[PDB]
């Protein structure tokens, strides 16, 4: 499950768990644990969705007052070098 | 279970690739929901589901007669029908 | 409250409650009870958001295989006629 | 409260209810919340669904005035 998990923060403090899931559209969210007013640990469906969600959302400016920080331990690990 | 018209069956995958290799081919065309390789010859089978039907249609627009052609590979891609 | 509730159906059978909330972006979802493979009862924040969600999503085509049906008992009820 | 998404409203005709206020602001974007607080005019409060929706209201105002055929709302940004 480690490869399904990401950390997300920086969103508005008012968000509930459903609002955090809406931030991650269209990725499949299977679980969210809030860890502060503006931070949560999120389980997505698999490591590919985690990898893409970090790419899409880390550093994303939601508005002039909020910027997301998104991280995970997922590393793209091709067996042969990419073309 | 799965999203209708968003899934592909893959043949002719170079045997040395893993799931990440296959992922990066399809990520060029859209968001990828799932991806797996299924280890006789120099080739293996695989499966890719796109995040949405529109993503899968973008893959379909980039195929040459059912083929996804790289510099060193030719993947034979068919719809998972349902 | 009745005026916070809507019915939504027709989305892909695969969705979980987080996926249903993502359908309703950007409205604030506070509760979801799935009632079948492709139907749910949803509580939004208030009657204005329910009203707008019904407008935005009823009849919405998600893809060639899925069309949303969205309904509620919320009625726009201005005290004086609109201009 | 979403920062920069809310408005204080003055000079609302006293006959309006929240639905009347809502439909004025819905013309510019999605509305999160809206309320009136009731001799001739009343106060109110509107929260837009996002900052971008509130900025759309701001682009359409004349010096903090939201003008209609039969009303002039005085609108200010709520700040914390």
Numbering used by the authors:
A (entry chain D), C (entry chain C): 200 to 282
B (entry chain B): 8 to 46, 50 to 92
D (entry chain A): 9 to 46, 51 to 92
Paper lines:
Consistent with previous work, PICS-1(PID-3) and TOFU-6 interact with each other via RRM domains, which were previously identified as the RNA binding modules. Given that the two structures are almost identical, the native one was used for structural analysis. For one half of the interface, Phe217A is buried in a hydrophobic pocket composed of Phe217B, Ala220B, V228B, and I231B. Altogether, both hydrophobic and electrostatic interactions contribute to the dimerization and the other half of the dimerization interface could be obtained via the symmetry. TOFU-6C primarily interacts with PICS-1A through α1-β2 of TOFU-6C, and α2 and a C-terminal fragment of PICS-1A. α1 of TOFU-6C interacts with α2 of PICS-1A via both hydrophobic and electrostatic interactions. Specifically, Trp27, Phe30, His31, and Cys42 of TOFU-6C, make hydrophobic interactions with Lys246, Phe247, and Tyr250 of PICS-1A. Asp26 and Gln34 of TOFU-6C form salt bridges with Lys246 and Gln254 of PICS-1A, respectively. In addition, α1 of TOFU-6C also interacts with the PICS-1(PID-3) C-terminus via electrostatic interactions. TOFU-6C also contacts with the other protomer of PICS-1(PID-3) (PICS-1B). For cells with tofu-6 mutants, PICS-1(PID-3) failed to accumulate at the perinuclear granules in the germline, but a large fraction of the protein changed the localization from the cytoplasm to nucleoplasm in germline and embryos. Taken together, the localization of PICS-1(PID-3) in the cytosol depends on TOFU-6, and the TOFU-6/PICS-1 interaction is critical for both proteins to associate with perinuclear granules.
